[PDB]
Amino acid sequence: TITPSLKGFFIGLLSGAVVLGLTFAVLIAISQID
Amino acid sequence: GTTGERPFSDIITSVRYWVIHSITIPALFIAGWLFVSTGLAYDVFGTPRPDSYYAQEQRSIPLVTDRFEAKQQVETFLEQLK
Amino acid sequence: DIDGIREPVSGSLLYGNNIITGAVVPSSNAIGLHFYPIWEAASLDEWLYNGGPYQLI
Amino acid sequence: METITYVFIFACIIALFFFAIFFREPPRIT
Amino acid sequence: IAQLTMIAMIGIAGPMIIFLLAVRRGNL
Amino acid sequence: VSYPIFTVRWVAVHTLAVPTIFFLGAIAAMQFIQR
Amino acid sequence: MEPNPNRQPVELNRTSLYLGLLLILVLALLFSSYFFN
Amino acid sequence: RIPLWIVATVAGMGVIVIVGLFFYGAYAGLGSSL
Amino acid sequence: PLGISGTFNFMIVFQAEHNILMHPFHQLGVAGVFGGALFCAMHGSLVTSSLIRETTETESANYGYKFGQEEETYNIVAAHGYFGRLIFQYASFNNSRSLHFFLAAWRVVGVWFAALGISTMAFNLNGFNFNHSVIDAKGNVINTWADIINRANLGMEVMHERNAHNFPLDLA
Amino acid sequence: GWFDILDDWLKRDRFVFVGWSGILLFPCAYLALGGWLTGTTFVTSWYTHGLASSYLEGCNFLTVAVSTPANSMGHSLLLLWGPEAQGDFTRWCQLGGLWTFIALHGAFGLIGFMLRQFEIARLVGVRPYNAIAFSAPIAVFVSVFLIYPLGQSSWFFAPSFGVAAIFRFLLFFQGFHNWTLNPFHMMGVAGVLGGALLCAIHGATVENTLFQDGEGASTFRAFNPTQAEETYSMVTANRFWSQIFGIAFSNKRWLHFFMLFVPVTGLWMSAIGVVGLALNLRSYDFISQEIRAAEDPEFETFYTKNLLLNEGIRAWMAPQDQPHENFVFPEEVLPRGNAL
Amino acid sequence: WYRVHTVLINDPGRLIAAHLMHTALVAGWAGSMALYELATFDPSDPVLNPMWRQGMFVLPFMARLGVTGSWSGWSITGETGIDPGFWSFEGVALAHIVLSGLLFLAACWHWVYWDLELFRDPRTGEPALDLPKMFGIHLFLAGLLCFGFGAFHLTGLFGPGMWVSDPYGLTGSVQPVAPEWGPDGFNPYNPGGVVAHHIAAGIVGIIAGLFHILVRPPQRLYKALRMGNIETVLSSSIAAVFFAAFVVAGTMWYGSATTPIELFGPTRYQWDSSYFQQEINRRVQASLASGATLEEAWSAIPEKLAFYDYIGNNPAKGGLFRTGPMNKGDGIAQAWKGHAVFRNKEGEELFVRRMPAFFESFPVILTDKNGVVKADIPFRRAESKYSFEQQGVTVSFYGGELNGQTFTDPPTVKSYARKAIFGEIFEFDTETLNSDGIFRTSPRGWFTFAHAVFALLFFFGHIWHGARTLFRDVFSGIDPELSPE
Amino acid sequence: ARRTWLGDILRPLNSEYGKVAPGWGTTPLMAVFMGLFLVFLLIILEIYNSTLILDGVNVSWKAL
Numbered sequence A: 001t002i003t004p005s006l007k008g009f010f011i012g013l014l015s016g017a018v019v020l021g022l023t024f025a026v027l028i029a030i031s032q033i034d
Numbered sequence B: 001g002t003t004g005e006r007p008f009s010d011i012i013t014s015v016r017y018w019v020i021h022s023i024t025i026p027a028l029f030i031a032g033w034l035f036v037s038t039g040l041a042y043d044v045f046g047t048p049r050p051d052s053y054y055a056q057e058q059r060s061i062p063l064v065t066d067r068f069e070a071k072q073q074v075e076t077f078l079e080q081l082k
Numbered sequence C: 001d002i003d004g005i006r007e008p009v010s011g012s013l014l015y016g017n018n019i020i021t022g023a024v025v026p027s028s029n030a031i032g033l034h035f036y037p038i039w040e041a042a043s044l045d046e047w048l049y050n051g052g053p054y055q056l057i
Numbered sequence D: 001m002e003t004i005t006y007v008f009i010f011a012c013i014i015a016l017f018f019f020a021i022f023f024r025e026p027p028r029i030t
Numbered sequence E: 001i002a003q004l005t006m007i008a009m010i011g012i013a014g015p016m017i018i019f020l021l022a023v024r025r026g027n028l
Numbered sequence F: 001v002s003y004p005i006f007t008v009r010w011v012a013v014h015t016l017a018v019p020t021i022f023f024l025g026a027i028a029a030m031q032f033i034q035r
Numbered sequence G: 001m002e003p004n005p006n007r008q009p010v011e012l013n014r015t016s017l018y019l020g021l022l023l024i025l026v027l028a029l030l031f032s033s034y035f036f037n
Numbered sequence H: 001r002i003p004l005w006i007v008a009t010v011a012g013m014g015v016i017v018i019v020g021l022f023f024y025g026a027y028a029g030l031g032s033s034l
Numbered sequence I: 001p002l003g004i005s006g007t008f009n010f011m012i013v014f015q016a017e018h019n020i021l022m023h024p025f026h027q028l029g030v031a032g033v034f035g036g037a038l039f040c041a042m043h044g045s046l047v048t049s050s051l052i053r054e055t056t057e058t059e060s061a062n063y064g065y066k067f068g069q070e071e072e073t074y075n076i077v078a079a080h081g082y083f084g085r086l087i088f089q090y091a092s093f094n095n096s097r098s099l100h101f102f103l104a105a106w107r108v109v110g111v112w113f114a115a116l117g118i119s120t121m122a123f124n125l126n127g128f129n130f131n132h133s134v135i136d137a138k139g140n141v142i143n144t145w146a147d148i149i150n151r152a153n154l155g156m157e158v159m160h161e162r163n164a165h166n167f168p169l170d171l172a
Numbered sequence J: 001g002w003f004d005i006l007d008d009w010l011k012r013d014r015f016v017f018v019g020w021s022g023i024l025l026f027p028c029a030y031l032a033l034g035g036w037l038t039g040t041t042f043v044t045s046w047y048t049h050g051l052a053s054s055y056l057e058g059c060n061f062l063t064v065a066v067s068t069p070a071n072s073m074g075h076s077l078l079l080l081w082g083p084e085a086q087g088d089f090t091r092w093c094q095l096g097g098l099w100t101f102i103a104l105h106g107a108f109g110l111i112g113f114m115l116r117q118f119e120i121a122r123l124v125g126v127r128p129y130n131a132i133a134f135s136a137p138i139a140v141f142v143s144v145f146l147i148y149p150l151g152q153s154s155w156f157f158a159p160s161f162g163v164a165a166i167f168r169f170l171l172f173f174q175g176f177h178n179w180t181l182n183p184f185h186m187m188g189v190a191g192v193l194g195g196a197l198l199c200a201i202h203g204a205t206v207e208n209t210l211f212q213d214g215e216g217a218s219t220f221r222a223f224n225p226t227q228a229e230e231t232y233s234m235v236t237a238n239r240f241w242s243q244i245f246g247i248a249f250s251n252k253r254w255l256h257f258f259m260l261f262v263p264v265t266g267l268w269m270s271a272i273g274v275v276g277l278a279l280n281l282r283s284y285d286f287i288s289q290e291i292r293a294a295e296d297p298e299f300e301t302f303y304t305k306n307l308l309l310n311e312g313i314r315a316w317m318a319p320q321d322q323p324h325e326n327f328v329f330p331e332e333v334l335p336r337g338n339a340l
Numbered sequence K: 001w002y003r004v005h006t007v008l009i010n011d012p013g014r015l016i017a018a019h020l021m022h023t024a025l026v027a028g029w030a031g032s033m034a035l036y037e038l039a040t041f042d043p044s045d046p047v048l049n050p051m052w053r054q055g056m057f058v059l060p061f062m063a064r065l066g067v068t069g070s071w072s073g074w075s076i077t078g079e080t081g082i083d084p085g086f087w088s089f090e091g092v093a094l095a096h097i098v099l100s101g102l103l104f105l106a107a108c109w110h111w112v113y114w115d116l117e118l119f120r121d122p123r124t125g126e127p128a129l130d131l132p133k134m135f136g137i138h139l140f141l142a143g144l145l146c147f148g149f150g151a152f153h154l155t156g157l158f159g160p161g162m163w164v165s166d167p168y169g170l171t172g173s174v175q176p177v178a179p180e181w182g183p184d185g186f187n188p189y190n191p192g193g194v195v196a197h198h199i200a201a202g203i204v205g206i207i208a209g210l211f212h213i214l215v216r217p218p219q220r221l222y223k224a225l226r227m228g229n230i231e232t233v234l235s236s237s238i239a240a241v242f243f244a245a246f247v248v249a250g251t252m253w254y255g256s257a258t259t260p261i262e263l264f265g266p267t268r269y270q271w272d273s274s275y276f277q278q279e280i281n282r283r284v285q286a287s288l289a290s291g292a293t294l295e296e297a298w299s300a301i302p303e304k305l306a307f308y309d310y311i312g313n314n315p316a317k318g319g320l321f322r323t324g325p326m327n328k329g330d331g332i333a334q335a336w337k338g339h340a341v342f343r344n345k346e347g348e349e350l351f352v353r354r355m356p357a358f359f360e361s362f363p364v365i366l367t368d369k370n371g372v373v374k375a376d377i378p379f380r381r382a383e384s385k386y387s388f389e390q391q392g393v394t395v396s397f398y399g400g401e402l403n404g405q406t407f408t409d410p411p412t413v414k415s416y417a418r419k420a421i422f423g424e425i426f427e428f429d430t431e432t433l434n435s436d437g438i439f440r441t442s443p444r445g446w447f448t449f450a451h452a453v454f455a456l457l458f459f460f461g462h463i464w465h466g467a468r469t470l471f472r473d474v475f476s477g478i479d480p481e482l483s484p485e
Numbered sequence L: 001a002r003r004t005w006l007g008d009i010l011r012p013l014n015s016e017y018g019k020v021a022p023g024w025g026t027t028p029l030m031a032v033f034m035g036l037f038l039v040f041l042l043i044i045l046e047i048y049n050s051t052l053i054l055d056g057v058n059v060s061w062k063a064l
Ligand SMILES: CCCCCCCCCCCCCCCCCC(=O)OC[C@H](CO[C@@H]1O[C@H](CO[C@H]2O[C@H](CO)[C@H](O)[C@H](O)[C@H]2O)[C@H](O)[C@H](O)[C@H]1O)OC(=O)CCCCCCCCCCCCCCCCC
Pocket: J073, J074, J075, J076, J107, J111, J138, J139, J142, J146, J147, J148, J150, J151, J153, J154, J275, J276, J278, J279, K246, K247, K248, K249, K250, K251, K253, K254, K255, K267, K269, K270, K273, K275, K448, K449, K450, K451, K452, K453, K455, K456, K457, K459, K460, L048, L049, L050, L058, L059, L060, L061, L062
């Protein structure tokens, strides 16, 4: 448990999510504005 | 058939364009040229200065030996040349 | 015998029994860019050694 | 064999050629 | 040092013979 | 007619367009260097 | 056991093979030698 | 209002001229034969 | 040499005496050939991708055209509406005749070039030479990809026509 | 219905259609086309192939590329936060990082883009024959960029993103693989050639069939766009070939679906053979031959000739090509004709 | 023809008979292959001629899951005094065989008896199938039959464990395995991570089954995805078949506990890892370092193990048209000749640089340690510097069959160096099946090659069928009447 | 439609045809199991690919 690459894998998961949450949250902003 | 087409087919002739763009083009050109003229580029991607390929002497090539500690190699393989 | 040296390389069927192998081999340096008219080879067997069939075709 | 096997498959393509440039089933104009 | 000037001049010459001809208007 | 400038057919253009005018610009520096 | 309706006629034209008979017979010539090895 | 034509000639030099620097840097550059 | 494998021999020799893969000509054979393939897939694609409605899988859809009819089994604008929609409009073809032409345009244009390329080197104006090109400061030789290409060449270079020439330079 | 709100915007006929596909297609299809260019002009492969990549190094357009990683790597996907670079753009850059990158993003871009066809043709309303025709290409790329590498030694031995870079890849195959002798590849050839032949046979078969349904001496003004029916009389052209080359068409419906087959078809062929090269399981030898050759210094076929090339284009190559397998090649040992 | 099998898209009557058949041609091919494989698998030896040598494609799969005994009286183990019952490669084969003619029989029922009761939807006077439902139970079932896999079989609670061997082909043997769901329970090599998987997803495969059998398909999915059209389920699955396909043809290539060595072959990456060597050698090192002689040292290293370090047993070296069992290639492996070390006048221990994957030919180069070239058979003889003879090399065998000897005459020495490039030299019986001398890939590799074109071809119409799914309407042709759009 | 022993006992299983449900309704609960899955697949993918080195997890033949 708590390996240096388990960590990198979590960090990668969020960064994955980070681009999902931002891309997706900015997609509906413009979604409903016309 | 239907087209929600915006200006375009003329916006180059745009009087304001070739103005707020007679500032943006060259401001972009040199912007990068510095990323180069500085030497930053190297330090960015690690690319070697034409003097930093082989150390002043030794004729080997810093080939990445293993797979898990690769970076470390590169590390010492970098400081190498001196 | 394409290249000059007398060392015939004949891919074919009734010799090189295959389709990817065999083919029609070129003329031989010997008689280069020279016109080798079947009727030159003092023997059709000669017109054969020297890629004669190639040209004509 | 083979040498034959090869000639045949060929002497055929020549057949299937003769059959398509003469027993072509006429294109109709309607 | 650099006649890079000459080539550009000769260049700009004829592509701007048309400019003047289009700004003076002249059945091109 | 009534046209805008901050359109997607714009974001696209500026995705690849400007880095490139940068890249080619960076290139001249590349073709001075030596030794 | 009454006959079956989903039994349409089986389609094939006289040059359809002229397209295939070629493809297969030629396909043969190539892939042959690699059989004789 | 700039002449749509001149928009095409001034630029058609941009490549025509930049590729010219490019082609020079191949006779003295870092990628020269010397 | 006329025969499957002789082709290759003939070819490999070439690539080893003329850097013909390093040609901005041979490029143009590929350029177009590697195009016609890319395009034959399109016009063939789109066209078939746009056919009226004449049978409903009773039999096939390739019957939507009895030969001779002056109609055009496929829909032109119905077609463009797509490609114009794939890559922005203006990029997809509007006029049908300016289309089909372009199809001889791509192939023939470069297939010629290639034809010239070989025909050019039959006089020894071979593909690009970058062997070593890229240098170091002291002078060490820094390898160009095309340097590798050199070995896979020098390799074939040496072995081809072995025992057929008694000197060091192949001038043919 | 917020789901339809996003949808709503997305697929709205902009200038260059976006779409749902747009959320996959567009990004990956960016950092890829991108990444290539990025390393093409800034990064060196010198630590994997001790060779120059970027334009900065002095390299030429042709001689540039984002060289696959050192074979020392394997197939590890070199994540940035991958234990390889441990998370470090500069190094991750040096360890070749861009490869797995460019390849994988392009992977998903090629996915996203095939889906980019299925979307449109379904909105606009048309047969899925475009996207279907994209199989040809997803194959080719998939066969030669993922499966190949994977079934072999390293990511290394995979093609490298550049011109001279792939040009190498070619000779490589001619050498230790003798690809040119494979039934498959000899079909890919069949496709990529005929498909082009068609692309032109028909191309100019058209430009020279159509009618005078316009005035001037130029065909551009000529009828369309979709109005009057047909420009080329498929009958007047027909009898032209049925009398010259013997056989011609009929039914442009198939001539438009045989134009699809030809290439998309043959191109898939090769893709198979190529998987075969993964396990080195290739078409190299013709038993019947080597055995008949072995015991007879007087039997020579092109086959053997070609076969000798390979050794040449291998002995000289490999060493400076496969640095990681420290090749040590004495001058003698090295094969080579007499006098050359 | 191109549509000749469309006559079933609807009536699951003559449609089940189709599946009922393909699936009798499959098990029909089952045992039939085995009798064939079976009818040619010379068991007499498992050390130099394992099933995986003499190309055996179906056999290997039996052993793995248990059946390793045969009514002939032997076992792919070596043992001679046992014999599972009806479940011997004999019955196993026989089994399917009966099944085929068995399934066939019933396949008939369903074509003639196409119009069947429950075959139609009640409310309407036409035939149809509640897909989401049939899937519900098929799924569920999957799960339960799965589940018990690890539950009894693989564990032994009821059945033969599964084949498992220790790090080096050596002591493999069918044996029960207890699940291990800690992290290591996910190492493609840790058997427990496969018996713990099958109880896991089987249990879960069950839940899903129940859910999917009860719950209902939320409209925006049943109307989005044209389900209700048997067409959609053919694409929603082609994709799962090719998905797993690709990976099975990935396990064989890359070490994988389901793909044992002793059953299919050596990992190509076992000749790349130099694997076998770093071991065999460490064994000569602990034996030598303790009370034993250089001649006594290698004698320890057993055949089996030496044999593995040979290239000819590396599927990497095959070729697309090397038509048969590896044995036809280099000959029927008879016995190990014994590791050979080359030396010279001086006496330094030279080392033969080996041939790797790609190369079908190599030049014999000798480099002592530290890596300097100390001898090599020269293609060019005139400016020969290291040439054998001139540095006069000599090899000596320790262990094996040729052991204790020391060869000195160039020709021979030179010979050994050549058969050296292949790794460990053995003596091959080529005569029996008249070998040719062109080592072929192994089934371990072969398999990998078909879950190729079969995986690759599959994906492509997952696109074509998945395109006849969403584009039903079109196909026949797009509406002869649209406006601008 | 022909009668059948086993058959009568099969439908309704076959009957509830167009058994649609309210709107996309149960979708979110689904794509939430995929979120866990797609990561899942990816978590082993990165362990096999030798990028996700876990404690006491030697991805070799040397397992036992
Ligand atoms: C045709 C239709 C195409 C459709 C197109 C669809 C496009 C969509 C693309 C999306 C997916 C692409 C991205 C997937 C990346 C997979 C990463 C990978 O590869 O991961 C790679 C690694 C494999 O591990 C390997 O392991 C090797 C040796 O391992 C062993 O090495 C020693 C053994 O001697 C030791 O025992 C050691 O402990 C042990 O690890 C080497 O180390 C390698 O460097 C290393 O890569 O992860 C593994 O386990 C591999 C497990 C993956 C399962 C198989 C999937 C890949 C299919 C290719 C395999 C088939 C082979 C091709 C042959 C012909 C094909 C028809």
